[PDB]
Amino acid sequence: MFIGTIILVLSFLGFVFNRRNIILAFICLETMLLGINLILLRNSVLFDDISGSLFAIVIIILAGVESAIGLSLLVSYYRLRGVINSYGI
Amino acid sequence: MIINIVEILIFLVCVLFSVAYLTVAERKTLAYMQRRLGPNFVGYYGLLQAFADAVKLLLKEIVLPKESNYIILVISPLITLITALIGWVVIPLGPGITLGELNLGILFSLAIGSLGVFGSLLSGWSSNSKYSLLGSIRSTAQLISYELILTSIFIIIIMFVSSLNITTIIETQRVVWYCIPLLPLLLIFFIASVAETARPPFDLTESESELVAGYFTEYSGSPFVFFFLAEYSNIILISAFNGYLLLGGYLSFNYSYLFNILFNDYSYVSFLFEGLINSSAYAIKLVFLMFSFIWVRAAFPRFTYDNLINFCWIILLPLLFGIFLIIPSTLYIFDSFPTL
Amino acid sequence: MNTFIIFIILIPIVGFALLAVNILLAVYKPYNEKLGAFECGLTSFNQTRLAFNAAFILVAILFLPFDLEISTLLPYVMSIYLVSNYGFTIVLLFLLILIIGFVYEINTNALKINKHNKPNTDSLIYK
Amino acid sequence: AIPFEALLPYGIIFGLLTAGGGAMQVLHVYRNGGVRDRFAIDQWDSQMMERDLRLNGGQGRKQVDQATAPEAFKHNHVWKSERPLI
Amino acid sequence: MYLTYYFIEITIFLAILCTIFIISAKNPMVSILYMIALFVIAAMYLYLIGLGIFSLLYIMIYIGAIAVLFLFIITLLDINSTELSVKSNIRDLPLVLISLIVLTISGLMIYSNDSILINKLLEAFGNDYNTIITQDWFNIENTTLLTTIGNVLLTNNAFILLVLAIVLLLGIIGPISITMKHK
Amino acid sequence: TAAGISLTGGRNRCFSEWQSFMHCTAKTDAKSRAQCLPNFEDYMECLHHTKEKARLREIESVLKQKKEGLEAPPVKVIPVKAIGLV
Amino acid sequence: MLILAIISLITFVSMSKLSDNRAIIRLINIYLILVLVLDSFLYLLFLNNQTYTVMGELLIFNSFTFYIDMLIYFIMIVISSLYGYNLYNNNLYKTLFEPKKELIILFLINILGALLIVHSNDFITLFVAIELQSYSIYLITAIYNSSYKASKASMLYFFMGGILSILIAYSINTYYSVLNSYTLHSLDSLIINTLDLNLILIALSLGLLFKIGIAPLHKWLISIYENTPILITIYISLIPKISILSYLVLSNISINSLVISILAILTLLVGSVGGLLQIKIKRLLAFSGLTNAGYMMLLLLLNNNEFSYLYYITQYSISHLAIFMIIIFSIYYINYINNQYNPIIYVNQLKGLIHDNAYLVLSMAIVVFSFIGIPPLLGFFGKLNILMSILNNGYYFISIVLIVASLISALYYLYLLNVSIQDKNNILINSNETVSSVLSYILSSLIILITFGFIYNSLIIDIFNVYFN
Amino acid sequence: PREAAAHWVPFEDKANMPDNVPDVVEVGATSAPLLSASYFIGAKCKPYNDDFMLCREESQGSGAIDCLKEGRRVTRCAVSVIEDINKSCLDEFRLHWQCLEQNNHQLSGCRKAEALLNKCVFTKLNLEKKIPGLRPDEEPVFLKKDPWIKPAVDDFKSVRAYAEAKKNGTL
């Protein structure tokens, strides 16, 4: 549970204290999702069930569609303003 | 410990040679299509031409231009090299002759062909130019767009086996090949295979783009020998994928009666003779297929990106949705679902 | 020690060795007019940012929701015998829900780039 | 007619893959000890191969056939101790 | 033999290390490349725990679609970025340290059920006992893990697969509908 | 849902303790679930092995304090290529 | 029957032109009406609080959820009539209130995602449906993309919804790590005694609640509600509130919650004193949502709250919907239209409203005395029946803070009246074009429910006695 | 039930079964002999195996210690089957499982030695190989002529013995 919790907490603090750009904020969100996956997959292996693996294979797809939707939101944000700020939106 | 290091030595040295002579054989047959000889000034009949190219190419210097990240410029040949070369494990040269037999070899073969896109796209940003970056965009968009229908053809084939193992597919194939029921699938898998390497039926980058030599224009030496090796390893690797899931992997005919004539008992000459027949059948599939790639290179002009995207997303993919619907329905109508 | 992991360790050492024999054996000898990107024998100014078409970005944004289906069809294809007659209809319905979003995409002509090369439609009305 | 110089590097590719597959099959049979590979291994099959390796004594797939098992056979049974998985 | 013992701990350390190069890298796309490395470390851990199927699902889906999407964005778009200067983030450092301590410990807290708070944390660390794996001969067929997922996504949770189809539909319709400019 | 479905589709490791607790809650109305405590305690320690780890550290703390250490039929560890050696 | 609407609709919208879009919404309006009328009778299934679980321990159907379902359909029939009908036939109002092509698509997918929460038993059904409605609010915010504020608000809403989705997912998997289970049906009141499920169920509740607008994290939602245009924001204000709250009121996982009680106190405080010195009408109108979402967080602490909840829901939905529809009508009478997406902003722009369409001020008055809790109006019995549940169950400091919060929140409610009944120099004497008959009948119907809706209080309770007991 | 992963360490215990449990002969047959004689140990020892699994069902979680007395008898009667099949047709049993040593222990690849073994055991040990759950007008698969799935290589000893049994007329 150490690797998933450490990925989640370090990715969360790297998201929060991001002031340098925006793509670091997206990739900190995705590394968070990886950490929640890791914690759950280990709990599935230790409990002898696919049940948490069922929630895992669903949240893989939902992390994917979150990336697709939100990166189209960024292209919409960039359409009217031909540059993305460093400090943030 | 001695036996697994000598087998991987001999498979390495058999595959790394066979990607060198592919390019020689390509210049040969492309010459005779165009009514001219190939190289014959480098060996007795033109052989070890690729070694002349390679030994000179290792002696040219490496220039790293001023706009570039020098690391990324040299690490994209390494990752494209290893990714085009890691996929040579899972092919069988006979029943259960792989370099690692794992229970899910298609998922590995399908995850490594997903890793090969990066060395295009990442190589666009090294030496960042706005005339180079957009060419890398067009290449990467084409590359993923045809990887989609590649993966889909795979899953249509695994509908018949319901096992991600590969020698399980080829043993399943002994009753009938999968090309002869699914004939249009051979044609569209061949053209998606021609697309996935960016062969020059379906090329735009090497010739038509604002760079004269593709995305890898500004190179010399080791970053060019690694890309050159990786493209033809990709040639024979997607040829291998066609060889096992659509044509017969190592299967030619029954050959039980010929054995009951010749042999008397299991002995090492019998396993040697059977291995020669099996890998001979696999090799002649794979050689007819590389000849088909070189043959379609000769006869044709190339594509606009609009023609290319209109080809993949609007024509081939709806037809593929019809194929998704028709084939499990045919396995449904008759009482035949495949068992694990 | 299987022979699977000798390979994944062993391809890189071959690649590092070929990169090393280039770095060791070829000369280096650069200067300023050798450095610099190639465009057809002419330098130029690169513009800091350039515009692009919405279909270019839309191909790879749109790529991922079709890719996620193709990996969602991958659990079914392994269990196709067990869910006889029943998981068949569920996978039919799943694929049909996908196909109607796909026919939305092909009816909007989202990936097509138009041409502004219009042949002067409007005729010559005079006076 | 057919050019031998065009088909000669294909003859090389054919011969290299053929000799590769033949030499590999001979190395696999020498590894097993005279018999063929097992190309798809179940969980049941993997447990059964471990049981056979416990039955015959040391050798991989000697494939003994005896009425009644030996006396070290009741005592050489192994459990697998897996680490914490932190 | 015992060289193959600390692998899991190595990956944990390696994964930790990778995140520091994600949040602190001068170029953006170099840090997104470090994120690709973090997916590879995750897939190493998933093979290492016993889930060899997932590792290749991560390399297929996360690395091959989501990261390719991200790199593809960063190429043809404009993003300013400032370097990790000491002067702008030294003001963040104390709340960083306090949140590291609290969020780390309190993430380690809920795996445990004593009412006393200090007994909750120490049960996080008492894992050094080795689980015994016994061979049971009750299963007759090679139902892998992916077969069982395809049985439970398709019978017991078929509605979740179908609402998931609505979500994948939305992931098609949305980006299109933003970036059209109809007529 | 997938309440007790295991990795191979079977029943999970703590299915029997869970189904025993569900037998306990099926025949029992509220304000009388206080008798249903030992089935729940058995289920939770089937999941997490808390009392088991407690008992093992209680006996491990005694194991390091003896200079004799072990006077018993011992447990012998083997390398993986020596399952059925002798 | 939302599924059939979405599947038919997006195929139909792919083939229609741009100019057809308006009329398409008219069709869908009538469609939803005949899902209320011709399909209501399913309430007969739910006698004596008979609950069903459908699709195998996956969706729970009781009559609480049936009422939430019917409420969501009614408010969508309203919102869809706002997009699908013209206000006036000017050359002005065609470029101000114009639907996009894919707007009704995202509307129905959002309602689908909001119904699959209130009907939900599982946690992965909960997670998938929160993800579906969160994407839909992302895209409904970003669909009017030729606006600087709406695009900035869609990005802000993306990242702040991503954090509070990963907090929900962490709470679900934290709950799974201590119990091999997905349901709160497994809890069954013995386990909570011997298991420390406080921190889990409370963190799950919080990660669900901060998406509403509970008050430590309330500023970003007030920014999204001010930045979005005037039609998008009467939907994205209402829907996640009633969906997520009627999830959390149905499953009672925060009872004697000290954290929910602090955050309820803090919500009632900084909502009432937050929106005092403010001059924008959507701001003023979005801190009314913060206090009225505060009155719900009280009911989470309760056991057996299904009367106070549902009555105050349909109270707030009618009052909400009416006060947003009134300031749509005041746009004809203002002397200054800026900002095409958001044409009225500052609350002093409706200043002479009594001298021009005085019965719009009668309407505005009737709905705003109902927000305060004036007893001839329907808002008062909502606050009354919350008070009857708070004082029954031991929350005595919560009650007096509720009252002080209601008194402070009456100030900026009455500021709307203060500005509206004033003298204006230049009054309208005659107008050529008049307001849409079918669209102003909706506001008249929404008032006569608020005015003369205390009539049926008795009947409702007797009906409430049969189907939920 | 789950596989060992991440540095599993095998350990054995030199210890003995206690006094109150009587001693039992264990099966020394290997996977190809066991897979060969599977149908005949299932034909002779149906009610004993059924008694074992039915006892193990009725005493839930008792499991190990309380149906030990019956798991004695299943091992004893299967040892009886394999001793009798040794003494009856050691040569043709050996022909069968040496065929099954190749071809991945697939039963599909060894039909012609299987016919010899089934005849020899039905003649002398008088046990028949059957597949239950098979309703009529459904041919059992090890009886059919021209199957679709043929092996890669027929082994030589069983083709020769099959042709000699044709010529002897015993087939």
Ligand SMILES: CCCCC/C=C/C/C=C/CCCCCCCC(=O)O[C@H](COC(=O)CCCCCCCCCCCCCCC)COP(=O)([O-])OCC[N+](C)(C)C
């Ligand atoms: C031919 C069918 C006509 C279609 C009717 C569609 C209505 C959609 C509207 C929804 C929101 C509007 C409020 C409806 C109140 C229903 C009360 C009920 O009865 O609620 C009860 C309990 O309520 C509650 O907890 C509290 C809700 C309190 C409502 C407060 C508003 C009062 C003023 C409006 C009501 C009186 C207006 C009548 C005008 C002549 C349970 O709900 P139920 O399961 O008994 O549903 C009934 C099935 N009915 C709709 C087909 C009959």
Ligand SMILES: CCCCCCCCCCCCCCCCCC(=O)OC[C@H](COP(=O)(O)OCCN)OC(=O)CCCCCCCCCCCCCCCCC
């Ligand atoms: C009753 C049952 C139903 C019957 C129908 C059966 C359906 C299943 C059949 C599926 C087979 C599909 C094969 C792929 C079809 C591609 C269609 C095509 O030719 O492309 C059409 C495209 C032009 O598109 P369009 O806009 O419509 O043109 C109108 C002009 N005004 O033009 C183009 O895009 C350019 C053409 C590109 C073709 C790729 C060629 C590359 C390589 C050719 C491979 C040749 C293989 C040789 C290999 C060795 C052979 C021994």
